DNA sequence: TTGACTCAACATCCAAACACTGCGAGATA
DNA sequence: TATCTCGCAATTGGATGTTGAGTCA
């Protein structure tokens, strides 16, 4: 809601991950933003 | 003469002290664009600070 | 906040031409606005080449033969031989300069070349950072020999200051074209930046006291020294270029912190087609040039003025007529035939001052004219509309059609007469036409012992003084239907009560109190 | 207001005044007329002689009209007269006329079809139900012995001007914001309508005001929200009518014309009509007591109870005793208020 | 590469004086 | 029958210049 009873999106619900090593953060980032363009085709397909 | 006095004294609207209202009235009446605030004249004449300007006052101012 | 910081790191994959007047007015503004800014910018970095400080490091980059060759001695028998040599040395320091400099750095966005309309809309859309430069930052750029092209010639002009030889910095300012009507504003991509710096903004003139001319010198974009007569290399040519490149306001800055305009000498074309292109282009904007320079033009005239001013004056008789029938389109000297109002006649025994062969039709030819020699005529009607009434038997000059139609005589102005309204009788008594109102379209037609007040409330105050006045017609407002209708806006009133009159329109405590005083003695 | 909404093109319609020049004789469509210029003394130019050689000339198959009641017959006869048309009608207003001579007006055009029922028409929706009621604010001492001693016009100056009526008027604005309801206020005094419309911050339609100032409120009063109170003098009530603002102010009463404010008053609930559920239209009346105008003011709720409208009394509503905002509450301001009055009454 | 056409949609210039209050509608204690 | 109010009466333009686009020789 929007402090009174009329719904808002003031900012979208995300998760804090925090990094420490170079490659590991290279390599989970990689594969989460091709799993995000999966994700895009699979929807594109759902939406038919 | 006295009485010369008192007529341009006695030249408003009332006859009892001369009122913000009543010199705003003249100077409206003779062209004066005069803010509210525009007092001056009759503002730096009220010598015992009751907001008008009585006969003595008057005089003095003249 | 932390969106701001952290970075969305994501694949979002995904397979007529003429603006409205209130723009043209604006781009007129913003024209006039930017000009002024880019000419104090000149006249401030004028400044900064004087630096003492920079001058007596510069001088150590110039030989003693190389002084002497820019300090000639003077040659009786032929000055030329001393043009001449000051020629090499002005070669030599531009060689010289070369190796000074070694860096040149690219304009970071178009340096001071022309923008385009929508390049300034959108530069107001993101914002910049931006590195500052300070006075002592361009002394240290000019003595480590690094920066942009604008620079070089900046410190190249310091470098002749600090040798003593009277060297002017040229400034091609470039504002936004107030001509450019265009919304859609954009320009060619292909070779954008060497079509850009084709010509240069900045460059130097040396004063040859031998010959009595400016000598042009670019020594960093076109390398080059020449000698204008008619033809300067560095007037820019070709559509490309003068895309970002549109001469029209070359101005100089001299030793002594002088300020000329110095289009002439590298404009071919300046009365016919550069002068559209100026804010110039009428009275307005002339006067308000003229101020500007002015405003920017801290010294005396010198006789060196007096030279340039001739060789102005010459370029001017010798660009004559243009070749072509738009350039000759609102001409300052000027007019063809056929642009000829039909309130217009040529003054007697006047004729023709030139042709124009045009472009596009064989052997076909027009008539052009000089402007100071054609006369323009108005009516009796129009002439008292500038407070002139005839002369005994005038004759007039010229017969033209109106509306219902109706044949109206046009007079000269040798043939008119200043109108003169009869006087005020003693009492203040205007005499007042058959609407009882007195017309005053000129200072002229104010009687010689009257005075016009105009004032909204003038008439009312009039009135109620009681006192002897003329209400005052001085123009006509053009209303809807079909109608006409007089401006009264104030009051002729006799000399003598003019401040009668203003303390009426205008009303201390003696003026408030008199004015009652009189108000009474005179209604009663 | 209806006839561009109507399927009327005035293109034809040409208006006739004998000021209000327009095509006569030349019209190819039917025409809109009126009584002043078809047949009355006020035939101030030719055109209304025009006009009627006109419609001489066109034997005018049918007649519209709208109260004939008010015009005298005698100019209705001639014209029938003269025109020798072919058919009438009359929009009647009122059952009994000063036009029911010996020649009546129906046999001159044609006997009753339909009686406006207003019992029929004034209960199933339009009106959304008036609710006449007159907050009975009080007044003060030293405004009472200087209204006894005015008297002839000059003491309605006294009566108009009350501290009381500030504190009923501020409550009853920010009443009707609170449940999202425009309001339109009333009112007969010029001046002391200007005093009351600059200082709670409502634009103004009064006399002689320009145009351009005059519909650029009611484009912001049709569209905007933020002005939910507009303060009209009577220019904008026998103009135009809106159909908003189910919450009505009386403040300013003329006596005599508590029927011309009747019909002021109803021509604004039959604006109202959408048929609403609720559909509350409340209609309040400032009226200070042991004054010359609420007794009047009597006069004219007492012809709503004959045009079928329930009046109730609301002698004060528990709610402005928790306002702030009510200018005039404190003593200081109703005594600077008194001194703005006597200003005022040495004035006129 | 040049400029003189034409087209169309605006923009811009320029002409240039009647008065002002009476008088009937409705309504009015 | 005397008294106010108050409305009512008395659709700038047309000629000429500027702008950019386009077509032609
Ligand atoms: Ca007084
Ligand atoms: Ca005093």
């Given at each position: 809601?929007?402090?009174?009873?009329?719904?808002?999106?003031?900012?979208?619900?995300?998760?804090?991950?925090?990094?420490?090593?170079?490659?590991?953060?290279?390599?989970?980032?990689?594969?989460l933003q091709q799993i995000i363009s999966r994700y895009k085709d699979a929807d594109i397909y759902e939406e038919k | 003469?006295?009485?010369?006095?008192?007529?341009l004294w006695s030249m408003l609207i009332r006859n009892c002290v001369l009122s913000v209202k009543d010199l705003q009235k003249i100077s409206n009446l003779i062209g004066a664009d005069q803010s509210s605030g525009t007092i001056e004249m009759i503002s730096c004449a009220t010598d015992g600070k009751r907001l008008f300007m009585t006969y003595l006052d008057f005089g003095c101012v003249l | 906040y932390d969106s701001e910081e952290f970075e969305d790191v994501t694949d979002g994959n995904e397979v007529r031409n003429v603006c409205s007047n209130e723009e043209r007015k604006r781009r007129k503004y913003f024209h006039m606005l930017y000009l002024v800014c880019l000419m104090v910018h000149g006249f401030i970095r004028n400044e900064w080449i004087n630096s003492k400080r920079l001058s007596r490091k510069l001088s150590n980059l110039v030989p003693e033969k190389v002084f002497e060759l820019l300090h000639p001695q003077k040659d009786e028998e032929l000055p030329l031989r001393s043009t001449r040599k000051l020629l090499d040395g002005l070669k030599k320091c531009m060689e010289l300069w070369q190796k000074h400099w070694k860096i040149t750095k690219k304009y970071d966005n178009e340096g001071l070349y022309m923008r385009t309309w929508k390049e300034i809309e959108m530069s107001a859309n993101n914002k910049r950072k931006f590195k500052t430069l300070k006075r002592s930052d361009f002394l240290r750029a000019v003595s480590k020999g690094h920066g942009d092209p604008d620079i070089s010639v900046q410190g190249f002009v310091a470098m002749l200051r600090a040798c003593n030889v009277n060297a002017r910095l040229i400034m091609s300012c470039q504002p936004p074209d107030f001509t450019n009507m265009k919304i859609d504003t954009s320009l060619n991509g292909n070779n954008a930046y060497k079509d850009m710096v084709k010509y240069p903004i900045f460059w130097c003139e040396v004063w040859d006291k031998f010959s009595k001319k400016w000598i042009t010198v670019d020594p960093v974009n076109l390398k080059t020294i020449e000698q204008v007569r008619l033809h300067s290399k560095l007037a820019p040519k070709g559509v490309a270029c003068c895309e970002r490149n549109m001469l029209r306001y070359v101005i100089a800055y001299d030793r002594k912190y002088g300020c000329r305009d110095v289009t002439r000498r590298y404009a071919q074309w300046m009365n016919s087609k550069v002068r559209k292109r100026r804010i110039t282009k009428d009275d307005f904007g002339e006067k308000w040039f003229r101020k500007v320079i002015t405003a920017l033009h801290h010294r005396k005239r010198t006789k060196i003025d007096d030279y340039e001013d001739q060789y102005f004056f010459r370029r001017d008789e010798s660009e004559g007529i243009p070749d072509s029938v738009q350039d000759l389109k609102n001409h300052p000297y000027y007019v063809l035939e056929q642009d000829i109002k039909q309130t217009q006649i040529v003054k007697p025994g006047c004729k023709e001052?030139?042709?124009?062969?045009?472009?596009?039709?064989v052997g076909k030819v027009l008539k052009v004219y000089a402007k100071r020699d054609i006369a323009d005529l108005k009516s009796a009607r129009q002439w008292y509309m500038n407070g002139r009434i005839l002369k005994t038997g005038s004759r007039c000059k010229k017969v033209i059609k109106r509306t219902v139609e109706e044949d109206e005589r046009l007079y000269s102005f040798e043939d008119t007469e200043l109108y003169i309204p009869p006087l005020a009788s003693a009492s203040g008594e205007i005499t007042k036409n058959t609407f009882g109102n007195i017309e005053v379209f000129?200072?002229?037609?104010?009687?010689?012992?009257?005075?016009?007040?105009?004032?909204?409330v003038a008439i009312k105050a009039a009135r109620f003084l009681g006192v002897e006045f003329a209400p005052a017609v001085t123009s006509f407002k053009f209303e809807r239907g079909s109608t006409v209708k007089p401006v009264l806006s104030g009051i002729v009133v006799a000399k003598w009560l003019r401040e009668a009159i203003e303390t009426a329109i205008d009303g201390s405590w003696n003026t408030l109190l008199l004015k009652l005083r009189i108000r009474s003695k005179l209604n009663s | 207001q209806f006839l561009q909404w109507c399927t009327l093109q005035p293109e034809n319609c040409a208006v006739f005044t004998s000021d209000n020049k327009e095509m006569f004789q030349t019209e190819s469509g039917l025409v809109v007329s009126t009584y002043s210029m078809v047949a009355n003394t006020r035939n101030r130019s030719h055109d209304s002689q025009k006009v009627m050689d006109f419609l001489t000339g066109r034997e005018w198959g049918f007649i519209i009209l709208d109260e004939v009641h008010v015009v005298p017959a005698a100019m209705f006869r001639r014209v029938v007269s003269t025109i020798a048309a072919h058919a009438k009608l009359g929009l009647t207003a009122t059952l009994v006329r000063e036009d029911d001579k010996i020649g009546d007006l129906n046999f001159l055009i044609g006997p009753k079809l339909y009686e406006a029922n207003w019992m029929?028409?004034?209960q199933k929706g339009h009106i959304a139900n008036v609710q006449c009621a007159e907050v009975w604010c009080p007044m003060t001492a030293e405004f009472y012995q200087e209204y006894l001693r005015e008297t002839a016009r000059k003491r309605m100056l006294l009566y108009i001007m009350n501290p009381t009526k500030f504190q009923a008027c501020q409550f009853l604005i920010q009443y009707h914001e609170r449940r999202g309801d425009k309001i339109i206020v009333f009112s007969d005094n010029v001046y002391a309508l200007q005093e009351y419309a600059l200082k709670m911050g409502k634009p103004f339609i009064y006399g002689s005001t320009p145009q351009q100032e005059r519909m650029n409120i009611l484009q912001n009063f049709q569209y905007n929200d933020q002005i939910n109170t507009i303060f009209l003098s009577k220019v904008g009530d026998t103009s135009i009518d809106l159909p908003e603002a189910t919450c009505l102010i009386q403040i300013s009463s003329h006596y005599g014309s508590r029927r011309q404010e009747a019909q002021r008053l109803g021509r604004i609930l039959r604006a109202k009509r959408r048929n609403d559920e609720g559909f509350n239209a409340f209609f309040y009346s400032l009226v200070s007591k042991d004054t010359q105008e609420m007794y009047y003011s009597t006069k004219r709720q007492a012809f709503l109870v004959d045009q079928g409208y329930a009046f109730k009394v609301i002698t004060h509503l528990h709610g402005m005793e928790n306002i702030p905002n009510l200018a005039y509450a404190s003593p200081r301001e109703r005594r600077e208020l008194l001194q703005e009055v006597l200003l005022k009454n040495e004035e006129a």
């Open positions: 809601k929007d402090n009174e009873g009329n719904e808002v999106v003031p900012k979208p619900q995300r998760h804090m991950f925090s990094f420490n090593n170079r490659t590991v953060m290279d390599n989970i980032k990689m594969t | 003469n006295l009485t010369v006095i008192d007529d | 001052c030139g042709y124009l062969k045009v472009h596009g039709k000129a200072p002229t037609m104010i009687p010689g012992n009257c005075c016009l007040v105009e004032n909204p | 029929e028409l004034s």
